[PDB]
Structure formats: C-alpha cells, structure tokens
Design a protein around this ligand. Structure first.
Ligand SMILES: O=c1ccn([C@@H]2O[C@H](CO)[C@@H](O)[C@H]2O)c(=O)[nH]1
Ligand SMILES: O=c1ccn([C@@H]2O[C@H](CO)[C@@H](O)[C@H]2O)c(=O)[nH]1
Ligand SMILES: O=c1ccn([C@@H]2O[C@H](CO)[C@@H](O)[C@H]2O)c(=O)[nH]1
Lengths: 450, 450, 450
C-alpha cells in the first residue's frame, strides 16, 4: 500500500549555540533534515509532512525547493502533538512512517524492513540494542510482540538489564494514527504528549506491535549538539569512503577523505590524503588526485593527474590533462584534452584548447585560448578601468612571451608570436610577431653597497 | 590555607634522543613543564618550586619569564631528594602539592579534589585505576585510608589483582613534608630516596593518608619518549576540540584540528578540516575557515570567509572581508572591512582600506592602501637597491593596472589611475592618469616552427 | 642451511575492480608483492620463485628489475599446484618458505622464528589467534605438534572454540616439498590442490609439524579488495611512524604522517601534521617541516625550516636555508647554505648560491645563481620561441629588480644591478647598472567612474 512520512523538525537546538534551528546544521554539506527528506523520498513516500517551528523563516529559505507539506507547530507540546498536526492529511489506508529531522543517518534499507514487518492495524517499532541503556525506555517482548515500553524509573531489577531500547521511529496506518493520537494524554513528569504511548494504546486495542532492530546503532542516533554532530559526520564519511573503496576507488586514507555531494567514477582512480569532493563530481578512468585537492562541481576526463594543493570549481577537464600543483580553476574553466596548467596559475571563465600550456604565475580570465598555445610565465589578462569585463581571444599555435599583459578586448590570431614584457592592446594578425623595443640606460662601474 | 607547588623537572629524557631536557618538549606548542606551571598557578599556588638539573641553561633561556623558584638539583638521587631541595622554602602551615614536569595533562579540577581531601597533618594521594597495573605500586585501603603501597615484587596473589595504583602526586602540609623527608632512606634495589615512602612514614606517625582517584587516566600520564608524547598531544587536542564543539564551534573533524594557544570565538563559526590555530586568535560571529588554513596571532571580524590554504600571522581582518584561497598575510597586515585578498597574494606590514581588492599574484609590503582601491594582478611594491625598506602610500579610489611596479618611497593620491605595465617612481597626483607609452616592432609573415 | 622462497602472486584480484593484477596494488608507494620480495631477500633467500599469471605483462613491466625466478602458472588449480610449479627448482637440502604476494606486512623477524622452529624433515606452520575464527581451519595441537587442521564444516563443538588458525605460510625442506606436493589431491568441495594438505601428509609420514604463532595479526593479513588494502596501509604507516617517534623524530600526529620510501634523520627533527615523505629522503639535525609539505627524493641539511605547503622533488637544500611557505622545488633544484626561497616561487634545474634570496612570485629555471644575490619579486627566466631551453648565468652579489625578465641564454656578471621592469637579452658586465628608460603619458584631471 501507499506510504507517507512525517518528519519532526521543530526544535530550537539550544545546545548548538547557533542562530539556526536544530535540523539545518549540515552533515556532509547538507542540512540534517535534507538527508531525512531524501531518504523518505527514495523510500517511495507520496507525501512528506515537515513539522517545523523554531527558525521557521530560515527553514523556509534554506529548504524552499523541497517537496514537503509545511506543517507549522506553534508550540512543542510533545512528539504526539507534533505528529497530530499532520494527521488530518493522513490517508486512512496509507502507511505512515515517523522520522526525526535531527537523526539523518537512518537508512532506506532499515526503514523498508520496518515497514514490511508492520502487522495489519498494528505498529512496527524501530528498536536498538545499547550496551548502556540507562535513561531509555526498555522494550518488553512477550512472544514476538512489544507489550510495553518501560521507562528508566519504572523498571524493576531484571528489566534494567534489557538492552533493547525504544528509538521513537515507527510505522502505522493513517487511520490507526488518527485514532490513537486523539487518545494520548500528558499525565507525566514532563507534561508532554509522547508518541511512545501509542504502543500502550495499540495493546489496549488488542493490536499487534512488532519490534524491528536497527542493524547499526549510529543509524538512529540524533545530534543535540555539535560534538554529537561531528561524530555523525565522521560515521557518514567513513561509510561513504568504504563504499567507494569496495567499488574500486583507491583512497590512501579513508579517515582523511571527505565527500559532500555525489561522486561518479571510473576504474583505477587514486585519491591521495586530505581531498575534499563537493557537489556533483565525475572522474574518469585512471584519474589521480594528489594530496590537499578540493574539487567542487567538476568533470575530469580519463588519465588526468591533478597534483597537490589544486582547487577546482565548476570546471571541465579533458582527458590526459595535467593540473597542479597549486593550480586554481574558477567557475567556467574548460580545459581540453592534453592541456597543462601549472603552479600559481588562476583560470577563470575561459576555454583552453588541446595541447596548450599555462605553467606558471599566470591569470587567464574571460578568455578563449586555442590549441597548442604556449602561455608564458607572468602573463595576465586584464581590463581597462571602467565597466564590464571584456574578452581576450587567442587563436591556435600562439606563443605569448612571459610577463605579457593582454588588455581585453583584444584578439590574437593563429600562429602569432608575442615577445616577453609586451603590452597588447591592439589586435595581432595571423603570423604576426610583436616584440617590445626597450630603451635601457647602461652605467659602467656602478659599485653596490659592499 | 595557603598553597605552594613543587614541580620535578630535572630529568635528562634520554629516550627522547634530543639535545633538550625532558620537560621542554612541547605539547600544543608549549613546553610540557609550562603546562604544569600554569596549572599550579591557576590552582592558587603562592610559590612554585621548580626542581631542575639537566639542560639547566636551556631551561633558563626557555622559561626565563616564569614566576618560579629555581631549585637546581645537582644529582638525581630520587623523588624524595628532589622535593627535599625545595623543603627549606616550605611554610609550615601551607599545603604543598608535588607535580611532575613530564605529566602535563593533570587538571586544576582533579588537583582541587585532591587538596580538599587532605586530612589535617595527613596526606592526600592521587591514585589511578589501570586495567593492567603490572609494575606499579598497589594501593592498599583499610577502611577509607591508604595503609600501604605494595610494589610489584612484594604483592601476594590477591594484591596483584588490585587495579588502583600510585601516581606519585600528593599533598601535605609543609611541616609534615620537612619532618618525613628527613626520614626517607634509600635501602632498596635502586638505591634511591623515593617520595613514595612518605605514605609508610605517615602511617608510622598515626597520620591519615586518603586516596583520591583521578577521573581520567591520561591526566596523570607522563611521557618518557616521543611516542608517548604524541599520544598526550592527541588526547589534549581532542579535549580542546570537544570543548569548542560543546561551546558551539562547528569543527568538521575534531581529529583534524589543532589549537596551539587560545581561541576566542563568536557564534556559528565553521572550521574545516586540517586547520591550525596558533598563539592568541580571536574569531567573530559567522567566521568560516576553509581547509588547510594556518592562523597565528590574528583577529578576524564577523562574517569573514578565509578560503583554503591561507596562512595568516600577526594580522587583523575586518568584518565581511574575504581572504584566499592561497593568500598570505605576514605580520602587520591590517585589512579593513569588506576587503578582498585573493590567490597567490602576499601582504606584509601594510594597511588595506575598506572595499579594496588585491586579487592575484601580487606582493604588497610596507604600504598604506586606502578605501575602494583596485590593485591589479601582478602588482609589486619594491625598493631601490640600497638600505632600509621605504613606504608606498596609495590614497582612496585608486586603480593600479596589472603588472605595475610601485617603487618606494612613493605616493599615489586619491582618484589616480595607473595603466598596466607601468613603473611608478614619482608621486602621482590627485586624479592623475599615468599610462606607459610602449614602443613595439611588428613583423608580418613570421612563421613559427610548425 | 640455505633458504629460498616461493611467492604466490598469480591472482586476478577481481574485487579490486582494476586493470592491474592483485599483487601490484601499492602499499606506501610500493607494489604489495615488492614488499614480500624485499622481505624474502633480507631473510637471506638465495632464490625467490615468483608464481605469476594474471596481468603477466604488467607484472613483467612493473617488476622488471626484481631478482626473481619468473614462474608462469597458466591455471590457478590451487596453492599446492602453484608451489609445485617452482618445485623442480628447489634444492633438496635447502629450506623453502611459502609466502603470499597479497600479504605484504609479514616481517623478517616472524619468519626467522618460523624457520628456526622447523624440525628436521618436518614443517613449521605459521598460525594466528583470531577472536572470531569462523571460516578458518583450526589448529589441533597434540603435545607440541600440529596433527590436524580442521576446517569450519568438520569441526565439532569444542574445536569450533579454538582460536588458533592456519595462515598457509610454512617452511619445509625442498626434498620434503617435492615428495608431499606430488601426493596432494583435489578431492574436496572446491576441486583444488590445497597446500594445507601438506600437514596431513607430513603426519602420515610420521614427520613433525610445529606451530609458530605470529605476534601481530595484521602481519599475516591479506587484501582482497581496496578497503582491506587501506587498513593494511594505515597499519603500516602507524608502525613506520611509531618507529620514527621512538628514534626521536617529533611527529605532531602520527595518524597524519605518510612515509613512502625511506627516511634518514638526525636529532630534534620536527614534522608537522599532513606531511608526505617519498622516495629516499635525508633530513639533518633540527630540520623543521611545516604542515602540508611533500618531500620526494630530497636531501635537507641541518637547521633548515620548510614552512607550510611546500613541494620539493629531486632537490638538495644546504644548512640553515629557509623554504616556504608555498614554495616549489622541481628536480635539479640545488640550494646552498643560508638561502631563502619564499611564497609562490618555482625553482627548476637551477643552482642558487649561499645567502641568496628568491622570496616572491618568481620562476627560475635552468639557471646558475651565485652567492648573496637578491632576486626580486616577479622575476622570470624565459626562452625565445624556438627549440631547446637555454641557461641563465647570474654571478655573485647581483641585484635583480622586481619583474625583470631574464631571456636565456644570457650572463649577468658579479656585482651587477638590474632595475625593476627590465628585459635582459644581452650579457651584463661586472658592476654594470642597467635601468629601463620608461616613457609615460601623464594626464591631469582624469576623473574615474565615481
Ligand atoms: O513537540 C515536539 C517534540 C519533539 N520534537 C522533536 O523530536 C525530537 C525527539 O524529541 C527532537 O529533536 C525534537 O526537536 C518536535 O519537533 N516537536
Ligand atoms: O631525583 C629525581 C627523580 C625524579 N625526578 C623526576 O620525576 C619523574 C618521575 O620519576 C621523572 O620524570 C624524573 O625526571 C627528578 O626531577 N629528580
Ligand atoms: O592456484 C593458486 C591459488 C592461490 N594463489 C594465491 O594465493 C592466495 C591465497 O589463496 C591468493 O591471493 C591467490 O591469489 C595463486 O597465486 N595460485
């Protein structure tokens, strides 16, 4: 049958000591709540009811394009109250899964088991075994069913030894939720309407609740502060790295690798220590990434080596190119096959054609460079003082001598040769040689401070 | 009552294989002994007696400004002998705490408990529970008192199972120390005067010794070699990072963060992987530090982003500034609000005014730059060959074209415009445009090696 | 008696998802099989029989200079079959040790114990204690001898509890191997000729097999995929770092240090976080390496500081030199004593004499620079457009003003002085001052876009 999700995300997150609400803090570059939404979506959720409250404005700006039902909870009177805000929108005969916006590691596969285990008119409850279950409600199994969740202060001696514990994530049909939520009270030390009480209410109705253990403890872990969040981050990165290693990516040290987005890869890819991969990155076969590199939204072709301490964003690199070390590709950098970009070089919004080299101490911006060009050390594309940023066009087989300033807008045609120390403001023709006539004063017998 | 400390720091540290004495090796950028001195000071110690010996000269040069009594122990005849060197300076009715210069992680809070537990005319002894106590003297409790410390080779079968062990750190009043130290002998396998024997001597006098367990084992851990020192370092950094995370600083990976000094911070600070913070650093609200950055003695204002692989020392950065990646601020760099410093830029002992940008391949040294200036790619401030390093003064709203050499001393007044490829040796006036007249030779039909 | 080794290395390594065969994947920059070969050599092996098959061509190109007997196994019919391929070459009265090309951490010291324990006409079998031995053949000791290796599916209840397990590495004399290998059958679920069966065959002959436990479990661990390989890598680096720390090298964080080759060092060497050492590196006394540095095949003299994010390859650095941060030494860089190389500087195949400084934004290639020179910011050595790369010769006590282009081939004699913004194409004489005569246009009252 159909499925929808409710995600509890209204919390202030006081112990984060932040201007943001609890669930907006990122794991691997994405808000915690976004992880949970995505997981709900790939589960097949038809609707996703997002219970929000604190930092409402920020939730709306940060998650503006999310396909969720925005359910504003004006006061946090308990998890049952929270879910009840969305209950009018539950279809009677759809399953509903309740998830928490501050528990981002929960997997599709665990939630599929949970949903599959749910008996008709009953509940499937996700539990977890802890080594120290102190403080948490103990699962009481009679036969293969949960008959009680006994809190810390009520448990007798033997019940205290139970390691199976309640996570609060559960599945039931919409009609059952509507019925039981109306029966939850707040007669307890905290004065709150707890979703937990649905288990007792289900048992009152002679309805079955079945326990499903989560395989991994960290899966169901929340973060109330940034220390806990950093542990979740590390668990997430390790799991991402392990998957990549098992797919055949050589990662020299998985504890020193960060993926913040998606990585598509070929075979025999080698990624050295302290690399960060951000947004959507695609690497071909035999790509080697040296230590310290940062790649954000890039496509790298087969057989490319990126040497250490290179930073690339919104860029495309063709096969057999060589980049680095200390290279910078800024958005719109498009390097063709067999290009060479070297140390202390910055390329911005420019195309560089096949075989061309830009190997030292150079800025190329808003430019088109053709094939088999030689851009010397110290070359700079610049503009006049004024308005917009105009274009430099360099054709094929051009030599640009070291320390040349190319003053846009200007065009240098095929086969041209420009001498070192030149300032180019006028168009250079095909097969034109331009050299600077220097005037020098030579003084003999100049003794330096000895 | 009053308190003073004795710190044992005379050891050669042979297994460090170093020219330095044992306690001078650093943890988080500070000599191990300096950690212990600081802790003794914040404990409220009136005097701090530093027992030193090996590497005496180096101890004096490295710790010249420390407020300690320099007690030179000519021969290491045992820990009791060491403490006895300082005993003439103990006040009869002050408490004395004995600490070790090679155990830098001991905390104020543990030492406060220890001092509080000390019975009148008695001793408080710091103990620790080990899982493998082999080799260490076992604490023998009869009632709530220590009656013996039984060494490895003397313990019977059941005493060998005791996990509580002697650390050697202890508190007693000055008069008691003077009395008992005179009674310590060296009749043992090593021929040494052990401070340990004070427990036996106290019991002989019908004086009470009380055990106080250290909460954390690493707290009381010493370092005899650099492997052990690296473990202490890692424990220290983890503890520093955890504190920061609990105060609301987002540290992407606490195992890849180093603090070597003090960090003051606002809210919503984000610190990426592999950052090093040195000396005194102050970060405002919403500061983002990218991967690989090194900040030593800097003040960073609100809303500043430092992009990856930037190195900053002795510098000030105003609010909303943007630095990096690959930027270098050397001592005396002062960047105003809303400034921009980009890749492969070095700024030394210079002020840069509000809104100004220095975005590529540039060296600015000994300069004053005003507000809303545009310093082009390839610009260099330089001096004549000779003596001292003179100043370049650039006013407000100045455009400096790419690859300009500014030859100090020189002044460029408000609103001036300098063309690319220029050498400025003479003062430029207000609203003066200076462009270089190039002479070029153009040769048509120059065929390059095809 | 004499010794030879057999190394099993024929495997395809399907789960690496690579074009390379299993054993060619690197640990610390060297193929796994190369580790095992080296270990066999330092053990004193007279012959090393390398059983190879899959990726044969790549094995030959990658290991072309290895002193091994190339034994091509056309089909992998089991470990006994593999060893039998080399058996015709075993000397009757030499010991033979069988090792695996995908288990690179096995040590000389463990293998020496194994060989020493081998009884005459018997076998010494390397075993290991696992906490979860499920799936592995259990060692059955009767007295001090192995009488059976009982596989998982045959073991009774009590045998399943045995933690001692078979590794497959073993030593026996050549004659015994020849005899027993001919008697191994393939009557089993997998249809393979297992080397394991030698233990049963030895017992049939009333020959003694003795177990020798490996001290470290990781020692005998293989890698079937890149996840397992990364764990081996991390174990290896940690062990290398621990050895260095115990020799007196200060490594700020051993988990963030990589050695890929050999390191020779003096005393009081300090290596900050995230350093990579490759090939053969030699560091003198008091060398400090800052964070992020990469050193490949370099010699560094006493008292050199390399500041953060410097990359050095095939270079020599004299005593008291200062490099970095953000410096690049490319192959053939030779820096004399007391030199200074600064940020965004690239030096390639050049000698730089004593006391000389090259501190910013500079490329020096194919050059000789003498002593006490001052190479200004923005200086570039370049060539004419044409063929080979010619040499720039700068003598002693030369000042080269900022942004000078030195156009090879050219010579600048002792004591010469070159002004900023100069293009040098002609030889400069001793004590010659060369300054550029600029022509500038000055326009007063030029109002910039306000
Ligand atoms: O009324 C509530 C109660 C709890 N929760 C969320 O559910 C999680 C578990 O209590 C917490 O993160 C909390 O913010 C809310 O969204 N609304
Ligand atoms: O006579 C001594 C004996 C020991 N200690 C120090 O006390 C510590 C514990 O023995 C060691 O680090 C040692 O250097 C000294 O300063 N003087
Ligand atoms: O016939 C064989 C059987 C196994 N092995 C190698 O021995 C190791 C243990 O089976 C594996 O890595 C496998 O590749 C081979 O070289 N030849």
């Amino acid at each position: 049958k159909a499925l929808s999700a409710v995600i509890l995300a209204a919390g202030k997150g006081t112990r984060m000591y932040s201007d943001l609400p609890k669930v907006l803090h990122t794991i691997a570059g994405k808000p915690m709540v976004k992880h949970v939404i995505d997981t709900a979506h790939q589960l097949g959720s038809e609707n996703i009811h997002l219970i929000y409250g604190h930092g409402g404005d920020l939730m709306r700006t940060h998650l503006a394009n999310e396909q969720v039902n925005w359910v504003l909870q004006t006061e946090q009177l308990g998890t049952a109250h929270a879910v009840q805000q969305a209950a009018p929108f539950f279809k009677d005969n759809e399953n509903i899964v309740v998830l928490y916006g501050d528990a981002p590691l929960i997997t599709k596969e665990t939630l599929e088991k949970l949903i599959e285990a749910k008996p008709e008119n009953g509940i499937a409850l996700l539990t977890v075994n802890l080594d120290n279950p102190t403080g948490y409600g103990r699962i009481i199994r009679e036969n293969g069913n949960v008959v009680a969740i006994v809190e810390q202060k009520d448990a007798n001696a033997e019940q205290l030894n139970i390691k199976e514990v309640n996570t609060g994530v559960m599945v039931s049909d919409g009609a059952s939720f509507k019925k039981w939520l109306a029966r939850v009270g707040n007669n307890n030390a905290q004065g709150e309407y707890y979703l937990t009480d649905l288990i007792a209410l289900a048992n009152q109705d002679n309805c079955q609740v079945v326990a499903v253990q989560a395989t991994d403890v960290m899966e169901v872990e929340g973060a109330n502060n940034r220390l806990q969040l950093a542990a979740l981050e590390r668990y997430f990165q390790n799991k991402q790295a392990s998957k990549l290693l098992l797919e055949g990516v050589m990662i020299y040290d998985p504890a020193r690798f960060d993926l913040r987005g998606t990585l598509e890869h070929g075979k025999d890819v080698e990624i050295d220590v302290n690399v960060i991969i951000e947004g959507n990155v695609k690497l071909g076969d035999r790509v080697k990434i040296g230590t310290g590199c940062v790649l954000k939204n890039v496509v790298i072709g087969n057989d490319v080596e990126i040497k250490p301490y290179s930073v690339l964003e919104d860029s495309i690199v063709g096969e057999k190119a060589a980049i680095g070390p200390f290279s910078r590709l800024r958005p719109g950098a498009e390097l063709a096959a067999e290009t060479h970009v070297g140390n202390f070089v910055e390329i911005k919004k420019s195309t560089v054609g096949k075989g061309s080299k830009v190997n030292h101490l150079t800025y190329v911006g808003d430019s088109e460079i053709g094939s088999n060009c030689n851009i010397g050390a110290g070359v700079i594309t610049c503009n006049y003082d004024g308005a917009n940023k105009f274009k430099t066009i360099i054709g094929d087989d051009v030599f640009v001598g070291s320390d040349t300033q190319l003053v846009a807008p200007v065009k240098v045609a095929n086969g041209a040769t420009i001498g070192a120390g030149t300032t180019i403001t006028r168009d250079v023709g095909e097969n034109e040689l331009v050299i600077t006539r220097v005037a020098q004063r030579h003084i003999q017998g100049w003794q330096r401070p000895i």
